[PDB]
Curated annotation (Swiss-Prot), chain A:
Induction section of the entry: Not induced by pathogens, cycloheximide and ozone treatment.
Topology class, membrane: Lipid-anchor
GO cellular component terms listed in the entry, alphabetical order: plasma membrane
Name listed for the protein in its UniProt record: Membrane-anchored ubiquitin-fold protein 3
Compartments where found: Cell membrane
Domain Ubiquitin-like: 6-72
Anything else known: Heat stable and remains soluble at temperatures exceeding 90 degrees Celsius.
Function: May serve as docking site to facilitate the association of other proteins to the plasma membrane.
Keywords noted in UniProt: Cell membrane, Lipoprotein, Membrane, Methylation, Palmitate, Prenylation
Covered range of the whole protein: 2 to 94 of 118
Tissue: Ubiquitous, but three fold higher expression in senescing leaves.
From Swiss-Prot, chain B:
SMART domains according to UniProt: UBCc
Described function: Accepts the ubiquitin from the E1 complex and catalyzes its covalent attachment to other proteins. Mediates the selective degradation of short-lived and abnormal proteins.
Family: Belongs to the ubiquitin-conjugating enzyme family.
Transmembrane segments: none
Pathway listed: Protein modification; protein ubiquitination
GO biological process: endosperm development; protein ubiquitination; ubiquitin-dependent protein catabolic process
Descriptive protein name: Ubiquitin-conjugating enzyme E2 8
Pfam families, per database record: UQ_con (PF00179)
Known catalytic reactions: S-ubiquitinyl-[E1 ubiquitin-activating enzyme]-L-cysteine + [E2 ubiquitin-conjugating enzyme]-L-cysteine = [E1 ubiquitin-activating enzyme]-L-cysteine + S-ubiquitinyl-[E2 ubiquitin-conjugating enzyme]-L-cysteine
Keywords, comma-separated and alphabetical: ATP-binding, Nucleotide-binding, Transferase, Ubl conjugation pathway
Keyword Transcription regulation on entry: no
EC number annotated for this UniProt entry: 2.3.2.23
GO molecular function: ATP binding; ubiquitin conjugating enzyme activity; ubiquitin-protein transferase activity
């Protein structure tokens, strides 16, 4: 009971998502972002170059890097149980 | 708790398939109190921005609309210094057919198409009607300062 699993798919500006992917509560947001930069699909008008260019949002909150999935949990964060969708926003700075 | 049940339903549906341009859930354990983010649409000067919104569902939802304030600063005819929004479907066009998703999406449409003739901020409404290119320019800028 500190290292449990959850499935995330990532919603993109396009409307397309990528995932689902399995991660642990112990995974960092920082990690999650790297995974995003990596699996970024081809032929987008936008492509995140690095990790410093992607913001992740889950249940209305912008998730900060150095927090972990487990500490980005809210009581109502996954009513259904199943896959959690998170939103990726790519900001060239 | 028709309200609770219906809010819960709206959460469930949202979490299954959220609108691509917005994210929302309950802040903590009060499920009448959500927070949300609007992603400024490509087809507006607020492109790239992420805007924070709070949401308070009234006790007799869905017969009355939710209360919705922006927390992030925006340059917009229909949103004022305190993040009050002038939005049709929170007023006379509320219907209990509508959902918080539908509301959140409307706010997107508002970013891409403001209504200067129903202003909450007359300098901006005037600038918009009078000198659109400058409105466009001005956030943009405020989108960079305050939403990035």
């Amino acid at each position: 009971p500190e290292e449990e699993s959850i499935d995330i798919k990532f919603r993109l500006y396009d409307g397309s998502d990528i995932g689902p992917f399995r991660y642990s509560a112990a995974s960092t947001v920082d990690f999650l972002k790297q995974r995003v930069v990596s699996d970024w699909p081809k032929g987008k008008t936008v492509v995140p170059k690095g990790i410093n260019e992607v913001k992740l949002i889950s249940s209305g909150k912008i998730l900060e890097n150095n927090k972990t999935v487990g500490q980005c949990k809210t009581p109502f964060g996954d009513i259904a149980g199943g896959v959690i969708v998170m939103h990726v926003v790519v900001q060239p700075s | 708790t028709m309200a609770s049940k219906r809010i819960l339903k709206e959460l469930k549906d949202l979490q299954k398939d959220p609108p691509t341009s917005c994210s929302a859930g309950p802040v903590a354990e009060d499920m009448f109190h959500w927070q949300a983010t609007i992603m400024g649409p490509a087809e507006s000067p607020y492109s790239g921005g992420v805007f924070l919104v709070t949401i308070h569902f009234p006790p007799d939802y869905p017969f009355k609309p939710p209360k919705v304030a922006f927390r992030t600063k925006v340059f917009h005819p229909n949103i004022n210094s305190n993040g009050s929004i002038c939005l049709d479907i929170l007023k006379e066009q509320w219907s209990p057919a509508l959902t918080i998703s539908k509301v959140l999406l409307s706010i997107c449409s508002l970013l891409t198409d403001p209504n200067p003739d129903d202003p909450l901020v007359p300098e901006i409404a005037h600038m918009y009607k009078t000198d659109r290119a400058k409105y466009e320019a001005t956030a943009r800028n405020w989108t960079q300062k305050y939403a990035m």
